[PDB]
Design a protein around this ligand. Structure first.
Ligand SMILES: O=C(O)c1ccc(N2CCN(c3cccc(Cl)c3)CC2)c(NS(=O)(=O)c2cccc(F)c2)c1
Ligand SMILES: Nc1nc2c(ncn2[C@@H]2O[C@H](COP(=O)(O)OP(=O)(O)OP(=O)(O)O)[C@@H](O)[C@H]2O)c(=O)[nH]1
Ligand SMILES: [Cl-]
Ligand SMILES: [Cl-]
Ligand SMILES: [Cl-]
Ligand SMILES: [Mg+2]
Lengths: 120, 209, 996
């Protein structure tokens, strides 16, 4: 691997379907913050349990803001401009949900640390 | 890359479409929308022996939406027969689906799947499920909803069709994702769309994730 | 342009159809999809069958011909009898002609198996309609045409296979009883000639593909033919020698011999017993010489998965287990059959080592049969000692966790039997497996877990003395294993396995107080370990030991100052300080189990008081602050504390039941005030923020409080012994707190748990609160029906709890329905019929049961004006609603209760048990019996609903139904006959006279 694991947490990822005005699940598994040892850039990489198929692959852009979801005290929603899980870089409204408020707050802390590393 | 036609059969509402959709997009569809005849979707897995593609023929289980029926089974190379462990009639009908399938496809690998093992009040007990034995079907308890054994039917069929018993699903390396600049012209667009999404609740807020 | 074929005003373009079909089968995305829709509309066009002979003649595409035969099949199975005889003979001859032509072309026979098989099935559909009455020569001509060609003979074996399946294997659901019996007798009459043909082909040999097709048809014949065709011909010898030697015939032959093993056979005949032994000996000798010796590693072979090896080994397992389960006594008392018996079992030991869960379960069912036999049958176990010794190792190495309940149960039962048969051999295997964990040779988490589950499974089988030395040995070894291991992952794995083993040996714990005490204090130490799985296993092990040894916590043990339950309670704050809420609830539940053992009331109430001290003090400070200032609830953290207090009460009430009353009495008033306060907060949150509020963590937290309060009350009332206190103290404040709140909330804020709680209240004390039941109906009936009567999907929990509540009210307090105003009673009847139309099996079955119970409730009232008005208003609504769900094919799971309800309704009229005319005057002569009128009404209703039935079919059906309305199994038979006949034209009316 050309990357170092900064943070690893179990999570469920959703993308908002604007047409059906509903959240659709994208995968469940280990959400990883990966630091590229050549560029020092940190991405989110998330793989599905058992299939190991990628459900998230994007840079933690400094311009991203984690917002609460009205339904949850253990979730964040953010716009992503360029995710390449399914191939061609696409824009998504993501929601990621954790086991606990504590995991969610820890995730927010780590995501901010990654934004600051990505500002360099 | 090798592509194999896979036919999915079983009673209406057993979870055929829900199971395939979970495999295609990752999503769990809660609504029952009965399949009309057949839906065909390519499904790719990455293995230690390279990629395998299933051309999935997800057929209608309701008689009135049956369409071509066994017309869908022609030149199938593998199959899943689905029932619902919460519905005895769906297991009672497994011999009927099997009969119609093997009359068209004489010598193919077939998995029998008891779906919805996530539901506490199971009606088709483990002891009752024996139809697979004399028919040489693989059997798995699955849940499209909890993902219990959700990969097992495809892994078993892939081992049978490639003819390598030690074949595994692997993670493909993840390409470095692009760095883009947020367009100042669509900035107003995105705050709107984020407003709608923050104020729509995530489903299943009582689950472990 | 593809939509060309849907235009029937113009002749069909075969080349276009061939394009559509090709697009569907080989095209992709949008193109495939459009072809799919066009093909479906073509096939479903009711005149499409007229195009089939044109398509079969002029299409190049075998996929077009397949779909043409599907269209022909719909005609043959549904509308065949509308066709003139000339047309039916034409179609018959075209189909036979197409089959013979495809068989006579070697290239087409080789490469078009799909189309030939589909053609053969179409022919069998015609035989089901025409044969033998309108085709007496079919079997003679098939037998004759079979000598003319090897391809035709082989295809004739496929036709006879399909015919046998359709008549004997799949007739049950697809034909009337009369028609099934007709076709069975017909095949039975002509079988002698079919067998002669099959025997000659099997004797005269040569073409493997012909031999295989003939054996495939024999497998089907074996489901129904008399044993003499097998035992009084050469055929047993051929199957068990010749056909086991070649691998083309081997798989099918083994399946034939499995069904041979299931034949109905005379029990008292030495020649037959010898023939049964001989085919087994011959089969096993061919396996050992042509396939693999008894010593072969079948685990390795199966794993390697070469060719058809996996299916062959599955089939061998099915053959050995089937034959030995029936016949092993034939092999047991003769010295010269001992080697055959033990070799067959040795093959089963080798098959039992294959890593294939479903194959393992097949062999385990056989081993269960064998060791159960050796446990009870005299002078048998000594034969099987070496087999049993190997099986001990196989079961122990394959033990699954008790969570897999069916497989763990089967494995445990086999290991318990094997332990009884040789306790020393079992102990030796388990100790030496433990030694190979300790020396590292077989060390892994899976391996120590497996062994711990196996050791646990045989608790209670050894003598108390043997068990004592065995348990001490195992605990000393696991403790040494723990010390020896490095890092908390490894130590936690062995620690969980020590907890598991101790928890499974209560007899040992109950005999050794010092040990039990140490175990408990060690579980209390592990309740401080945050390492994942340790706290959960300590709590699970605690409640499991308490369930089994509770009496030892409630007495004063020698050299203790007090009952140990006092020591647990005194230190409860410290013991539980590091647990998650659900672990705390388990702990308190376990304490409730112990306290319920104390049968002195003053002492039990005092221990209950002491156990509930910390939740009662947290509660008292909240109730003081919360009532002094209502705004304090809005606080997220307080809501979580309140919910965890109520959950602690539910946990302790679960284990204490009737004994919980004084604690319920202490919190009851303030708990119901909290219910109202939390309700107001949810209401005003939904006003302030909208329906979205009900998704918010705050409102979900508040609703959790309401649901746990309802769960506490339902838990207590379901187990209460003093029902006078339930009615006098609990019910009135409960109904005042919950009913109006439920009624006056918007649908999305109503808790379905209210309905569940009321179900328990009516169940337990409904007879004693007639005015309370009326109040329950008035509060929940119309507002709940209005939530669930727009579709079958919205509010699934409310739907289920609603019909459970109506069911218990109709059973216990039917007077509540007599009190309803006519319009509300009509809504009740509408609600029951609505339940009938549900596919969800919970609602449908409650719906049908309420209907039965309601009829029973009206019958009981005897000849009075409410009963008479009920029949005049509702009898025909219930008869026609029942018939609707019986005949629409969308409600097949409700069949039995639909039939029971219809039988009851028909028997009321057949017995003249309805006092008034069901018809309104000037509709029939005024003398007319309700029987005559019901006949007429049903004739008219069935004629309108099924206009393709003749008057004769309907009159005969209804004649049979009314005669059979005291015999449920026969009545159900007549209903099933009717469900076959409505799917076709020209059903025989004499079918309803079927008897025996
Ligand atoms: O003689 C006694 O009264 C006695 C009392 C308590 C004993 N235990 C049982 C509890 N225990 C234990 C230790 C760790 C975890 C768990 Cl769940 C239990 C090991 C110590 C044992 N255990 S033991 O295996 O029989 C034993 C015998 C001789 C010396 C020992 F150090 C331990 C004996
Ligand atoms: N609890 C539970 N529900 C499931 C599961 N899988 C599917 N369902 C639900 O059950 C229904 C199944 O619907 P479908 O998957 O469309 O059924 P289908 O088998 O495709 O039906 P037809 O297309 O009519 O043959 C949906 O409501 C699913 O949400 C499962 O594992 N557990
Ligand atoms: Cl026997
Ligand atoms: Cl005891
Ligand atoms: Cl019809
Ligand atoms: Mg579907």
């Amino acid at each position: 691997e050309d990357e170092e694991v900064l943070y690893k947490v179990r999570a469920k990822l959703f993308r908002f379907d604007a047409d059906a005005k509903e959240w659709k699940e994208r995968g469940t598994g280990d959400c990883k913050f990966l630091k590229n040892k050549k560029t020092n850039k940190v991405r989110i990489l998330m793989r599905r349990d058992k299939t190991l198929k990628i459900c998230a692959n994007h840079i933690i852009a400094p311009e991203y803001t984690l917002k609460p979801n009205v339904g949850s005290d253990r979730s964040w929603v953010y716009a992503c401009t360029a995710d390449i899980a399914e191939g061609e870089a696409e824009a998504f409204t993501f929601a990621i949900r954790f086991g606990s408020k504590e995991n969610a707050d820890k995730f927010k802390e780590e995501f901010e640390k990654a934004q600051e590393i990505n500002k360099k | 890359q090798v592509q194999f036609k896979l036919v999915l059969v079983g009673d209406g509402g057993t979870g055929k479409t829900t199971f395939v959709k979970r495999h295609l997009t990752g999503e769990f569809e809660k609504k029952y929308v009965a399949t009309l005849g057949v839906e065909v979707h390519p499904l790719v897995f990455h293995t230690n022996r390279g990629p395998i593609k299933f051309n999935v023929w997800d057929t209608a289980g309701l008689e009135k939406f049956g369409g071509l029926r066994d017309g869908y089974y022609i030149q199938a190379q593998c199959a899943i027969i689905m029932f619902d462990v919460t519905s005895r009639v769906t297991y009672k009908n497994v011999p009927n689906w099997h009969r119609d399938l093997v009359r068209v496809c004489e010598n193919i690998p077939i998995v029998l799947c008891g779906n919805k093992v996530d539901i506490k009040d199971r009606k088709v007990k483990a002891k009752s499920i024996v139809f697979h034995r004399k028919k040489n079907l693989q059997y798995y308890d699955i849940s499209a909803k909890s993902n219990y054994n959700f990969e097992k039917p495809f892994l078993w069929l892939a081992r049978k069709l490639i003819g390598d018993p030690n074949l595994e699903f692997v993670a493909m390396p993840a390409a470095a994702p692009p760095e883009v600049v947020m367009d100042p012209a669509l900035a107003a667009q995105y705050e709107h769309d984020l407003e709608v999404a923050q104020t729509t609740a995530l489903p299943d807020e009582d689950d472990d994730l | 342009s593809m939509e060309g074929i849907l235009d029937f005003s113009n002749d069909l373009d075969i080349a276009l159809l061939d394009q559509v079909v090709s697009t569907f089968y080989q095209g992709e995305g949008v193109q495939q999809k459009q072809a799919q829709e066009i093909l479906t509309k073509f096939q479903d066009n009711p005149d499409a069958w007229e195009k089939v002979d044109q398509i079969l003649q002029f299409s190049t595409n075998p996929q077009s011909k397949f779909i043409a035969l599907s269209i022909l099949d719909k005609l043959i199975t549904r509308k065949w009898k509308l066709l003139p005889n000339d047309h039916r003979i034409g179609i018959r001859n075209f189909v036979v002609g197409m089959i013979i032509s495809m068989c006579q072309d070697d290239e087409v026979f080789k490469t078009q198996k799909n189309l030939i098989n589909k053609s053969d099935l179409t022919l069998v559909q015609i035989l089901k309609q025409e044969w033998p009455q309108n085709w007496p020569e079919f079997i003679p001509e098939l037998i004759g045409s079979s000598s003319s060609s090897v391809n035709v003979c082989e295809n004739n074996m496929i036709v006879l296979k399909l015919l046998s399946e359709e008549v004997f294997d799949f007739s049950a659901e697809q034909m009337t009883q009369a028609k099934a019996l007709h076709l069975k007798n017909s095949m039975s009459k002509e079988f002698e000639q079919i067998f002669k043909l099959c025997f000659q082909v099997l004797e005269q040999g040569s073409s493997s593909s012909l031999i295989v097709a003939t054996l495939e048809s024999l497998l089907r014949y074996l489901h129904w033919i008399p044993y003499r065709y097998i035992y009084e011909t050469n055929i047993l010898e051929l199957l068990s020698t010749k056909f086991m030697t070649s691998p083309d015939t081997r798989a099918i032959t083994l399946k034939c011999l499995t069904e041979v093993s299931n034949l109905k056979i005379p029990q008292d005949n030495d020649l037959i017993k010898r023939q049964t032994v001989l085919f087994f000996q011959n089969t096993l000798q061919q396996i050992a010489t042509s396939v693999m010796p008894v010593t072969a590693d079948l685990k390795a072979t199966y794993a390697n998965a070469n060719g058809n090896d996996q299916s062959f080994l599955q089939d061998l397992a099915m053959f050995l287990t089937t034959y030995l389960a029936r016949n092993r006594a034939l092999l047991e008392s003769d010295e010269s059959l001992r080697e055959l018996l033990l070799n067959a079992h040795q093959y089963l030991i080798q098959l039992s080592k294959i890593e294939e869960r479903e194959l393992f379960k097949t062999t385990l069912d056989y081993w269960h049969n064998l060791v159960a036999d050796l446990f009870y049958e005299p002078l048998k176990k000594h034969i099987y000692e070496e087999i049993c010794s190997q099986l001990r190792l196989v079961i122990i190495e394959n033990m699954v966790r008790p969570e897999e309940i069916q497989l763990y149960k089967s494995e445990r039962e086999v290991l318990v039997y094997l332990t009884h048969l040789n306790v020393i051999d079992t102990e030796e295997i388990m100790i030496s497996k433990l030694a190979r964990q300790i020396d590292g040779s077989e060390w892994s988490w899976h391996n120590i877990n497996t062994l711990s589950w196996a050791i646990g499974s045989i608790s209670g089988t050894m003598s108390e003395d043997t068990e004592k030395r065995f348990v001490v040995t195992v605990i000393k070894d696991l403790l040494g294993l723990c010390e020896q291991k490095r890092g908390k992952d490894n130590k936690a794995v062995v620690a969980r396995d020590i907890m598991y083993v101790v928890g499974e040996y209560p007899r040992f714990l109950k005999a050794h107080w010092n040990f039990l005490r140490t175990v408990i204090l060690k579980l209390f130490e592990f309740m401080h370990e945050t390492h994942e799985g340790v706290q959960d296993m300590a709590c699970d092990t605690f409640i499991k030991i308490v369930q089994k040894c509770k009496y030892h916590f409630v007495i004063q043990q020698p050299r203790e100052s007090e009952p140990f339950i006092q020591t647990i309670i005194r230190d409860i704050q410290k013991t539980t300080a590091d647990l998650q809420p659900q672990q705390v609830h388990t702990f308190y539940k376990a304490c409730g189990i112990i306290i319920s053992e104390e049968r002195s009331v003053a002492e039990r109430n005092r221990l209950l008081s002491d156990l509930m001290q910390l939740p009662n003090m947290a509660w008292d400070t909240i109730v003081e602050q919360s009532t002094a200032n209502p705004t304090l609830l809005l606080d997220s953290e307080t809501v979580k504390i309140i919910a965890n207090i109520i959950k602690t009460n539910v946990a302790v009430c679960t284990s204490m039941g009737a004994d919980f009353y004084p604690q319920l009495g202490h919190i009851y008033y303030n708990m119901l005030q909290l219910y109202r306060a939390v309700s107001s907060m949810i209401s005003t949150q939904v006003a302030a923020e909208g329906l979205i509020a009900t998704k918010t963590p705050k409102v979900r937290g508040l609703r959790t409080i309401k649901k746990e309060i309802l769960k506490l009350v339902e838990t207590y009332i379901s187990k209460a012994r003093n029902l006078d206190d339930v009615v006098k103290v609990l019910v009135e404040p409960l109904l005042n707190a919950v009913l109006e709140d439920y009624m006056n909330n918007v649908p999305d804020a109503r808790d379905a748990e209210v309905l569940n709680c009321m179900t328990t209240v009516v169940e337990k004390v409904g007879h004693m609160i007639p005015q309370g039941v009326i109040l329950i109906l008035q509060s929940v009936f119309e507002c709940t029906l209005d939530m669930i009567n727009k579709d079958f999907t919205e509010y699934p929990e409310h739907r289920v709890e609603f019909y459970k509540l109506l069911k218990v009210i109709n059973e216990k307090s039917f007077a509540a329905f007599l009190e309803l105003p006519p319009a509300a009673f009509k809504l009740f009847v509408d609600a029951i019929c609505w339940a009938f139309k549900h596919n969800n099996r919970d609602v449908e079955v409650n719906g049908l049961q309420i209907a039965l119970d309601l009829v029973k409730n009206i019958e009981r009232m005897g000849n009075v004006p409410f009963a008479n008005e009920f029949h005049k208003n509702y009898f025909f609504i219930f008869v026609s609603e029942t018939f609707f769900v019986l005949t629409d094919s969308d409600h097949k799971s409700g069949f039995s209760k639909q039939a029971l309800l219809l039988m009851k309704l028909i028997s009321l009229v057949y017995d003249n048990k309805i006092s008034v005319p069901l018809y309104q005057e000037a509709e029939v002569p005024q003398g007319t019996s309700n029987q005559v009128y019901l006949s007429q009404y049903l004739a008219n209703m069935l004629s309108n609903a099924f206009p393709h039935l003749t008057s004769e079919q309907i009159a005969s059906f209804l004649s049979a139904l009314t005669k059979q309305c005291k015999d449920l199994v026969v009545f159900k038979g007549t209903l099933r006959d009717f469900l076959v006949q409505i799917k076709e034209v020209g059903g025989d009316p004499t079918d309803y006279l079927f008897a025996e």
